Amino acid sequence: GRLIYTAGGYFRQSLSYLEAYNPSDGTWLRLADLQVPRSGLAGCVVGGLLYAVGGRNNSPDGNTDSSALDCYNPMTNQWSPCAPMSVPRNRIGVGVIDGHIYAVGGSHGCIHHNSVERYEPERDEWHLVAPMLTRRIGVGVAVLNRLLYAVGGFDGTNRLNSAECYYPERNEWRMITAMNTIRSGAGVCVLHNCIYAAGGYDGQDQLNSVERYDVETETWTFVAPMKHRRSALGITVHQGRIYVLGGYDGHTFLDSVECYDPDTDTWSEVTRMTSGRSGVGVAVT
Numbered sequence: 457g458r459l460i461y462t463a464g465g466y467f468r469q470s471l472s473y474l475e476a477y478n479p480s481d482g483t484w485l486r487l488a489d490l491q492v493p494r495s496g497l498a499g500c501v502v503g504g505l506l507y508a509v510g511g512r513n514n515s516p517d518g519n520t521d522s523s524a525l526d527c528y529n530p531m532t533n534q535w536s537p538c539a540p541m542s543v544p545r546n547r548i549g550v551g552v553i554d555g556h557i558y559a560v561g562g563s564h565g566c567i568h569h570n571s572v573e574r575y576e577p578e579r580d581e582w583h584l585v586a587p588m589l590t591r592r593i594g595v596g597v598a599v600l601n602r603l604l605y606a607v608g609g610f611d612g613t614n615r616l617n618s619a620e621c622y623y624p625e626r627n628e629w630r631m632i633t634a635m636n637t638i639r640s641g642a643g644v645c646v647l648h649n650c651i652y653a654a655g656g657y658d659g660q661d662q663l664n665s666v667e668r669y670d671v672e673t674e675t676w677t678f679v680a681p682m683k684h685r686r687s688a689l690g691i692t693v694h695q696g697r698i699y700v701l702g703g704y705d706g707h708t709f710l711d712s713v714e715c716y717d718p719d720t721d722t723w724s725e726v727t728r729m730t731s732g733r734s735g736v737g738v739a740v741t
């Protein structure tokens with residue numbers, strides 16, 4: 457009975473919600489608010505704990521990019537602060553390898569980072585690792601075969617179809633085949649040994665298209681598109697299906713949650729969030 461957690465987000469201002477969806481019975485839990493509102497963050501899980509990484513607090517009274525790392529324990533319904541990153545990272549990407557959290561890219565003001573740093577929960581410390589070949593904000597991250605992939609984003613000048621691969625044992629990055637479509641703000645995840653990139657913004661339109669990367673054929677292939685165009689959607693995988701949550705469709709902040717079934721190559725609407733929002737962090741535990 458693992459749950460889909462969605463933390464933070466944006467609607468008129470950065471949000472503090474933590475809510476958890478149960479796909480088996482369709483219920484939503486309202487859990488402890490974040491201590492500081494944040495949008496453009498990422499979520500991940502290590503050791504059954506949920507982590508909220510990076511983002512920004514955009515409020516009527518100011519706009520502050522976040523270096524914060526905060527840890528939610530489902531057993532206690534409590535957020536605890538952790539050591540902060542070396543730099544604020546709004547529109548960050550995150551992946552986990554061997555129980556370590558990798559924070560990639562994101563922005564601080566107009567600085568678009570290529571830097572990458574790694575968090576060790578047992579010692580509550582961050583350390584920089586090799587930087588990406590490309591500056592990327594609004595970047596999607598996938599972990600596959602104990603390699604970390606950074607997909608798409610915005611380099612400060614252009615939205616990107618490029619993607620690159622981090623080798624943790626070697627501490628180095630290499631460019632891989634570029635996507636079919638330029639995507640900033642896509643949801644990026646791993647399902648059945650392929651990397652999926654769904655939605656995003658190509659510099660003109662919000663996208664409903666979805667493409668997936670086969671690391672051996674080194675080819676991106678379109679699959680069925682989502683029912684809603686969305687950028688800055690949340691994304692996760694639960695019991696062999698992709699879930700996308702919220703995002704902005706060009707006009708409204710969506711509450712729609714769609715579900716992709718790889719066996720039938722179809723998307724379905726499965727639930728709604730309790731309010732529309734974009735820029736959430738999402739993880740499963």
Ligand SMILES: COc1ccc(S(=O)(=O)N(CC(=O)O)c2ccc(N(CC(=O)O)S(=O)(=O)c3ccc(OC)cc3)c(OCc3ccccc3)c2)cc1
Nearest residue numbers: 466495496512546547594640641657662687688704734735
């Ligand atoms: C008013 O609406 C929104 C939508 C989302 C957010 S937000 O807080 O969640 N946030 C920023 C963050 O986190 O600081 C963000 C996320 C996603 C995006 N997008 C693009 C992407 O993904 O790179 S986009 O949704 O497709 C979009 C939204 C507005 C827009 O205006 C013309 C054009 C595109 C995004 O674009 C900003 C933008 C504005 C003008 C021109 C180009 C980009 C911003 C806030 C307000």
Ligand code: NA
Nearest residue numbers: 470471472473
């Ligand atoms: Na809120």
Ligand code: NA
Nearest residue numbers: 515518519520
């Ligand atoms: Na603020």
Ligand code: NA
Nearest residue numbers: 529530531532
């Ligand atoms: Na419990």
Ligand code: NA
Nearest residue numbers: 543544564567
């Ligand atoms: Na700085």
Ligand code: NA
Nearest residue numbers: 566567568612
């Ligand atoms: Na920069």
Ligand code: NA
Nearest residue numbers: 576577578579
């Ligand atoms: Na650790």
Ligand code: NA
Nearest residue numbers: 584585586627
């Ligand atoms: Na290094």
